[PDB]
Amino acid sequence: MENFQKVEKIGEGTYGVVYKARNKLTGEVVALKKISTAIREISLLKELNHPNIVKLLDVIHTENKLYLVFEFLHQDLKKFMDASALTGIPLPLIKSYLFQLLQGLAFCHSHRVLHRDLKPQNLLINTEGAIKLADFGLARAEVVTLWYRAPEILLGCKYYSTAVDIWSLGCIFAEMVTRRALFPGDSEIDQLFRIFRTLGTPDEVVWPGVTSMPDYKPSFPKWARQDFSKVVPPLDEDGRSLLSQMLHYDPNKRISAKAALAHPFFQDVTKPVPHLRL
Ligand SMILES: O=C(Cc1ccc(-c2cccs2)cc1)Nc1cc(C2CC2)n[nH]1
């Protein structure tokens, strides 16, 4: 750590404090996260390189403290969505961001690496129009938000799949479009019942095996499903169809990142420049 000069505190992650810092040897500006199976799994993430994944530059284990050195980006999507609240993020920019994030997920999922905790706070943007996934793989190795958590996790599936990240990304896509969180639960049951009130209480018809899940209760109220036309206006039919597939209850039915990239919604995808004031 004597090789890094702290500039300022930029966040409070799940595991510890995040600083903006300067590398004295290279002149590099980085993000520094202060945190044996953990060392080995984190060392594997150093190799998981993609343009839509925030680069893990180094892992430093000293005085039984763990420091992760990451590429620095100047803003996150939560701040950008707050800044764009009055006007809304333009649809071509939403589409570009969703397309890039799906590329990032398709890459990590092809290497059997899950994120598990996608949220606007860990989606980072730059002036060029890029968006990148941060904290990839750290879940495997302040109240933690439940808003983007997949229903199978809430229902007690301990051996969940890459589909959990598609669910979280569908929640974020809906929030960019409507300028409001899709399912802002403030407890596990509030989170689950918000999902059920919008998508309908799941049953064996739409999700075979759901009633045998560890935290499933036959006493759950039975709510009818709502039309996406009511849930995400003014999203067009291509976007609503894609979102529905990203929010299928059965993780096996839920669209993969690779199949989502082929969706007709991306026929006219472009890479616009965002409006950023730093
Ligand atoms: O999290 C951000 C965005 C951000 C940037 C600056 C600031 C502040 C500036 C002044 C006060 S707070 C607050 C947030 N970036 C970032 C994080 C990471 C790695 C995952 C750690 N890499 N890059």
Curated annotation (Swiss-Prot):
Xref: PROSITE patterns: PROTEIN_KINASE_ATP, PROTEIN_KINASE_DOM, PROTEIN_KINASE_ST
Family: Belongs to the protein kinase superfamily. CMGC Ser/Thr protein kinase family. CDC2/CDKX subfamily.
Domain Protein kinase: 4-266
Gene name tied to this protein: CDK2
Cofactor: how bound: Binds 2 Mg(2+) ions.
Effect of residue 146 to R: Reduced phosphorylation by CAK and reduced kinase activity
In-chain residues carrying the UniProt-annotated modification N-acetylmethionine: 1
UniProt superkingdom: Eukaryota
Pfam families xref list: Pkinase
Sequence positions that bind ATP: 10-18, 33, 71-73, 76, 119-122, 135
Alphabetical keyword list: Acetylation, ATP-binding, Cell cycle, Cell division, Cytoplasm, Cytoskeleton, DNA damage, DNA repair, Endosome, Kinase, Magnesium, Meiosis, Metal-binding, Mitosis, Nucleotide-binding, Nucleus, Phosphoprotein, S-nitrosylation, Serine/threonine-protein kinase, Transferase
Phosphotyrosine: residues carrying this PTM: 15, 19
Protein name: Cyclin-dependent kinase 2
Species for this entry: Homo sapiens (Human)
Binding site residues for Mg(2+): 122, 135
EC number(s) given by UniProt: 2.7.11.22
GO molecular function, one term: protein domain specific binding
Assembly and binders: Found in a complex with CABLES1, CCNA1 and CCNE1. Interacts with CABLES1. Interacts with UHRF2. Part of a complex consisting of UHRF2, CDK2 and CCNE1. Interacts with the Speedy/Ringo proteins SPDYA and SPDYC. Interaction with SPDYA promotes kinase activation via a conformation change that alleviates obstruction of the substrate-binding cleft by the T-loop. Found in a complex with both SPDYA and CDKN1B/KIP1. Binds to RB1 and CDK7.
Active-site residues annotated for this sequence: 117 (proton acceptor)
Modified residues (Phosphothreonine): 14
